[PDB]
Amino acid sequence: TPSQKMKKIRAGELSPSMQQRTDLPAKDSSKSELQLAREQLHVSVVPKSLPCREREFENIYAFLEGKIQDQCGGCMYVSGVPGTGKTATVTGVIRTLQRMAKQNELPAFEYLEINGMRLTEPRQAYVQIYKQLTGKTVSWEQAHALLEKRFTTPAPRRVTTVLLVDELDILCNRRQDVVYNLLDWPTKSAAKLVVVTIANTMDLPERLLRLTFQPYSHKQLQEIVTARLGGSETFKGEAVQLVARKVAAVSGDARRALDICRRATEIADTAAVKCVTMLHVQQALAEMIASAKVQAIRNCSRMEQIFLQAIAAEVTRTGVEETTFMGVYQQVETIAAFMGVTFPPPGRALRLCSKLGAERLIISEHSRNDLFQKILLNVSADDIHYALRV
Amino acid sequence: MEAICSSLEPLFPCREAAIETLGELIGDSSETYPSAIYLFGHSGTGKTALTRAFLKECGKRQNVRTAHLNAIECYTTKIMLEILLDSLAPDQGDALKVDNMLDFVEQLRRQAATRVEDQGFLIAVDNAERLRDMDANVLPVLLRLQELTNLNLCVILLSQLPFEKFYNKTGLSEIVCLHLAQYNKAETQRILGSDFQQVRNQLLEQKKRLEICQEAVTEDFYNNYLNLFLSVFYKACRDVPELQLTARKCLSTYLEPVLDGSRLWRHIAGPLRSALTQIYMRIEELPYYAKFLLIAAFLASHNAAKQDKRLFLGPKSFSIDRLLAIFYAILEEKVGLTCNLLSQISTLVHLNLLSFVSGEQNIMEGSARLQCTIGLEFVLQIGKVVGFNVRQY
Amino acid sequence: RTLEQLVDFVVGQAEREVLPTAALLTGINQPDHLSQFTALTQRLHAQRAAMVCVLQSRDCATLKAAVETLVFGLVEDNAEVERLRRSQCTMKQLKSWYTNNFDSERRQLVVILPDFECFNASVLQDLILILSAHCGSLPFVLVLGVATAMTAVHGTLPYHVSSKIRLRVFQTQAAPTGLNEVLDKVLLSPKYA
Amino acid sequence: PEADRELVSIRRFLKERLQRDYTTLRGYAKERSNVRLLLQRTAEMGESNSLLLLGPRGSGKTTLINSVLADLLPNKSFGENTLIVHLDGNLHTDDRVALKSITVQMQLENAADGKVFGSFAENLAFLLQCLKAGGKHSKSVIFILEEFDLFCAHHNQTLLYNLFDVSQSAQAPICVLGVTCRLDVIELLEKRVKSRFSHRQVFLFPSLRRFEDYVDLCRDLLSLPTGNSLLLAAEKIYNLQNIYFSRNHFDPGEYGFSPRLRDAWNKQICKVLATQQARSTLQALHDFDISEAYLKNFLFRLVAHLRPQSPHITAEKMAAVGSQFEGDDKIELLCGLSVLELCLIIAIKHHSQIYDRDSFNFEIIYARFSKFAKVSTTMQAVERSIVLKAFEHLRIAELIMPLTVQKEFEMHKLALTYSQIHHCMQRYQALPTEVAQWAQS
DNA sequence: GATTTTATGTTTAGATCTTTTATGCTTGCTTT
DNA sequence: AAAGCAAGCATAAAAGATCTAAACATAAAATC
C-alpha cells in the first residue's frame, strides 16, 4: 500500500533502488586497447593516489589528523577555480582516514557530508545533516533544535565528526543564517566538531559574512593524463602536451583535459586507427572549443545577411552600439538599394529580427514595441564581414 | 468541407472567401489540421461570430471536440487550462484538476484514440492580443500543441493586431496567417440589406399606417435608404454592428412622411446630422466653493508657473498650495480654512475632477503633485453659472 | 419613481450579447444613496427575480480580485436569501452553480457599482468586457452610480467597451432640490414645536 | 467518381506527410550517426555522456532525436537497458514540475500510477539516492532536455547541476542530451555547471543554403513515393508501434496508389517545378528563410487548395500563395480604416514629418486636423467626440504607441515608416480627393 | 470508516535592493 | 535689478527583480 511505503521512506528503512539490467554487462576481454584506453580516461574514475596533488593531500591529512586525535575541532576553508580537484582530494583523504580507522590506528569517527546545490531552500540543510546523523527525518525547526541539543550540551562521550561542505556559497541567504550557524558550531568546545568547507571564490567570508588549490599548469596537466593512460602507448607523447597547452591557459579544468582526450579517442575510433594522431587532437579541440557564429552567419538566408550588414553599418554611422530599429531599417533600405534585391516590408523584417534574436546573433526586445525595439550587436562586427566574404 | 462552408455562407454573406479558406484548412475532420491558424481583421469584421459558428457547426456536424475561449477571462493560466479541458474532455465532472501546462498536456494526451474514428480537435482563443501580456510561455505552447500532445488539433487565435506584434525573444513556431478585409461600401450595403425581411416583419408589428407600411416598405426603397445612410455615416465608421444599431433607429424616424403624405432626404438629413453627433455613445450640480476650486485648478494647470506673478505641452501638474493661493486671489471674500474646504479638495480628487501623479504618501506634506482635468467649455459654463468670467486671467 | 423604474427595468430584462445596464445619476455625496441601494436589493428579494452583490471599488484592486468578489458576493447573497474557497471561485464555477440551481424556473444577476468614478479604468474595462463575454449564458445587469455627469461615462469607457454596452440613465433629484423639499416640508412644517 | 476519390487520397496523404511524419530525416548523415553511436555507447558499455544539440529554430533537431530513437528502440538490447526521460522547458516550468515528471517517468517506487507523494525536497533527495545506488549493473538513464536555456533560467540551475554531476561520477550510467536553439547557451551555465559539462556540441545548420537542393526538397515533398517504399516505411512504423509520439504517425500502410497515378503526379510536379514562375516564387521564399518549416507551411497551404473541381497543381497557385506571403498587412490594415482615422493618421504624418518624428498628442493633432476641417466642406459636421473615438481606435489597433493623465493628453509615437502611409494612400479605395490634395501637401 | 485537526509544503502578495531616469529644485551664470 | 535659462543635483518614484513573511490548502495521522 502507498501509506506503508511512504512511511518506509520517511523513516528510511526502505532502500532506494533502480531497475537492474536484464541483459548482463559486456565482458572485459572483448574490449579493444583503444576502448580500454577510453574507459580508463573517463572523468569518474578517480585514482586512489592523485598525481601532482601530494602537497595539498599531506596538508589536509596532517591537519585533519591533528584535529581528530586531539579532540578539539575547528574550521578549514579550501578554495579555488573549478576543475582543480578539491572534492576528490578531500574525499580521498577522508577515505584514507576511514581505512585507517578500520585498522584502528585512529579513533573512530562519523564522516558527515552535505552538498549545497542538492538542497532546495538552504534551511533544508538542517534536515540533511541530521539525516546523516541518527537517520531520522524531521521538519527543519525541530532539526534545528535537535542539532542544538547534540551541539549545545556537554555530554561525553562526544565523538568527533567531520563535516565536508560542498558549495558553501549557495547556502547564502538574505540573513545568511545557515552558513553562520554552520561556522559557529565548531566554536563550541564541548561538541567536538570540525568543518571543511569547499568554495570557488577565495575571499567569501570577507565578501558577505585556509587553503587554495591553484589551477594546473602545462606540466601538471601533462602528468595527470600520462598517469591516467597506463602503460599503453595509444597516445603519442606530444598530444598530451598539446592538450595541456590549449587547456592550461584557458581554464585549467582537469575535466576538460580528460574529456578532450576522450573525445579525441572517439575520433580515433572513427578513423579506425589504433593509435591517435595529433590531428585527431586538433579536430577534438576545434570541435569542443568553438563557436559556430561564423558558420551561423555564413548559413543564414540572404535577408538576414543584409540585416547583419546593416546593423554593423548603423554602429559605424551613428557611432553607438545599441540601435533603434528604424535607423537599422533605413540602413537596410540603403543596402537593399545598392545590392539590387528588394527587401521585405517591415513586418517580415520584424520576424527576421525576432528569429536572429532567438539565435543570439543580436539582442532584441519583445516585438510589441515595433520600430522602437532596441537592438544590440552580439556577434563582433568583424566576424560578419569575415563570414560573408571569406 | 463542403457541407460546413455551404451551411455558413447563407448566414454570412460577403465572406465566401474566408469561409472557403477556413473550410479547406479545418473543414474536413478526416484530414490533419495545421498547427495554428491566426485569422485577424479590424473590429466588427465578423470573426468571433465566424469562428463561433464554425466551431459549433463542426462540433454538431462531425467528430470534433470544440472549445471556444475569451482570453480576458484568463487572468491566470490555470483558469485557461480549466476552461479548455472542461470543454475538450466532456463529462469529466469535478474530478478535473489542472495545475499547469504539463498536467493539461498529459490529460489531453490521454484523450488520444484510434485513427479509425478520425477524431479531431479545435480550439479558438478570442481576443488573443492579451495572450502576450500574461505568463509568456502560453503562446509558444499554444502554437505547437499539436506537436506536443501528439493529437489532431488546431489552435485558432483571434485579434486585431497583425501577427508581427506577437513575437518574443525565444521565437515562435509556424502559424497560418489569415486576413479578413473590412467591407467596402457596396458590401456593407449588401450586409445591411440582407436583413430587409426581418425589419419588414418588425415594422408590420406596429390601421392606415400598417396599410401604407405593407405597400411601401419594399426592397428598392430600403436599398435607397441604405444608400442615403451610407452617404453620411460611412466616412465616420465602417463598423457594421454600429451601422446596424443606428440604421434601425434612423429607419424608425425616417418613415413618418411616408406614413402620412426622394421627397424625404431633407426631412431625415436634418436628424441624421444630429445622429452622427451621437455615434458610439449608446444612450436610449456642484457646491459654490467647489466651483471656484475647479476654476482655480484650471488656472493653476493652464496659466503656467510664471505668468501668475502678473495676473495676481498639455496641462501642467501643480502643488495644492498654488491652488489655495489662486483660490485666495480669486475668492475676493477670504473664507476661513475650515475642514469642509480641504474635504472639498479631496472630493474633487475622488470624483475624477482632479487627479494625482505623485506625492500620494505625503499629501498632508503639500509636496503632492495634482493635475486638473477639464477642458475650456465646462469651466466656461462654471464661470457663466457663477457669472464670473475667467477669460480675464 | 426611480426605484420602481429600476425594478421595472430589471424585470423587463428578465423578460428578455450586449449587456443591459442602467446608470443612476447620484449626487456628489455618498451615504444618502447607500440605504436607497439597499432598498433596491430588498425589492429584488421581494419579487424574487434577481440577486445582487455590491461591487465597491475597494474590492477591485485587480481583475482577479474583482471576479472573486463578484462570484463570492453572488453566491453569498443567494445563501443569505436562504463558504467555497477564495482561490476556486472562478466564473466557470459561477456558471456551473447557476445551472446547478436556477434553470427549471431565470433570476437576474445584479452587480451594483456605487462608485463608478473611484474605479481604476483598466480593471473596470476588463470587467465590463468579461461580463459582456458571459451575457446570454448568465443574465447580467449592471448599474453605474456615476457621481458626476454623462461625459464621465462616455470618456472613461474606451471605444470598444462603449461598443459592447447598452446604458440607460435614471436621475435621482438634485441636492439643492432635496434641501428645498426637506425645508419646506419638515423643518417649516407647523406640527413640530 | 473513383478518380476524385483518388485525388482525395493524394490530398490526405500529402497533408499527412507535410504535417506529421515525425521520424524521417533528410540529410545530416554525420550528426545523426554521431548521436546514434553516442546513444549506443551509453546504452551498452555503461558510459555516461553529455551532449547539446544546437541550431536555428526549424532545423531538424527534434526530428533527429525521433529518427535516432526509432532506429535504436526496436533493437531489443537498447530497449531493455534504457529508460528514457523526456523533459521540456516550456511545460516543466519551475524545477519541481520537472522533478515530478522524472520520478513519474522513471517509474520510481515513490511514484504511483502517474502521481507522486511527499515533499519536493524528499523527492530530490530520493532521486539522488536512487541514482547513487547504480553501478554499471543499473539500467541506463537517457535524459532528453528540450529547451535547455529555460532550464538555465531555473534557480541556481539546480536540476542541471545534479544532472551533470551524475554524469561525472560512476553512479548510474546516464546520458544528458540537451536540445536548444541559442548558440551561446553554454555561456549561461554557472562556472560549476560549465565545469561539469562535457563540452561537446553538435550543430545542425541546414544544408539547403544553395537553391538547387531546396528545389529538390520541394520536388521531394510533393511527390508520391513508389509503393515498395510505402511497404518498407509501413514495416518500420509497425515495428516501432509494437513496442510519446508513436500512437499517431504518418502510417503509409493506410494508403496505396497505382504506379501510373504516381507517374502522372510526379510528372505534373516536375513539370510545374520546371517553369520559371514557380522557380521565381520559391526563389523569393528561399531568399527569405531557408528553414524547412517555412517551406512546409507554404506547401501545406498550397496542397489544401486541391479541390476536386480543379485537380491539378499549377504554377499560378504557387504565385498566389507567394503573393499572400510577400504582401504586408499593416498596409492591408490601413485600407480598412474609415476616412476620419485616415485623416488623423495623415495629420500625424504631417506633424512628425514637419517636426521630424517628435512625439504628439490628441490636442496638437486636433489643431492640425481642425486646420483641415474648417476648409473641407465634407468634414465640417464631425465634432470633438467622433475624432476622439477615432483616436482611441487608432490606439487600440496599435497603429500608435504610448510613450512608456487625461485620455485626451497622452504623449504618443507613430508606429509606421512613411512608405507604408504613402502606399496606403494609393491602395485605398474611393478616397475623397480633398484628402489626396492634403496628401500632396 | 469517517471526521477533525494540525503540520507542513506551496502559493501569493508584499518588502526590499537596483537602477533608471528624471524631474522638481538649487543655485548660479548670464542677459535685457 | 531681476528674469530667465542652464549645469547639475539630489532625492523620488517607477518599474523591475528578487527575495521573504503571511496565508493557505492539502496530506496525513490521531481519535472517536
Ligand SMILES: Nc1ncnc2c1ncn2[C@@H]1O[C@H](COP(=O)(O)OP(=O)(O)OP(=O)(O)O)[C@@H](O)[C@H]1O
Ligand atoms: N590529481 C588528479 N589526477 C587525476 N584526476 C584528477 C586529479 N584531480 C582532479 N581530477 C579529476 O577531476 C575531478 C575532480 O572532481 P572534484 O569534484 O574534486 O573537482 P572540484 O575541484 O571539487 O570541482 P568543484 O570545486 O567545481 O566541485 C575528478 O573527476 C578527477 O577525474
Ligand SMILES: Nc1ncnc2c1ncn2[C@@H]1O[C@H](COP(=O)(O)OP(=O)(O)OP(=O)(O)O)[C@@H](O)[C@H]1O
Ligand atoms: N458577412 C456578414 N454577414 C452577416 N453578419 C455579419 C457579417 N460580418 C459580420 N457580421 C456581424 O458582425 C457581428 C460580429 O462581429 P464580431 O463581434 O466578430 O467582430 P469582432 O472582431 O469580434 O469585434 P471585437 O473583436 O472588437 O469584439 C455579428 O453581429 C454579425 O452579425
Ligand SMILES: Nc1ncnc2c1ncn2[C@@H]1O[C@H](COP(=O)(O)OP(=O)(O)OP(=O)(O)O)[C@@H](O)[C@H]1O
Ligand atoms: N532536417 C529535416 N528533415 C526532415 N524534416 C525536417 C527537417 N527539419 C525540419 N523538418 C520539418 O520541420 C518541422 C519541424 O521541425 P523540427 O521539429 O525539427 O523543429 P524543432 O526541432 O521543433 O525546432 P525547435 O525545437 O527549435 O522548435 C517538422 O514538420 C519537420 O517535418
Ligand SMILES: [Mg+2]
Ligand atoms: Mg566538488
Ligand SMILES: [Mg+2]
Ligand atoms: Mg470580438
Ligand SMILES: [Mg+2]
Ligand atoms: Mg524541436
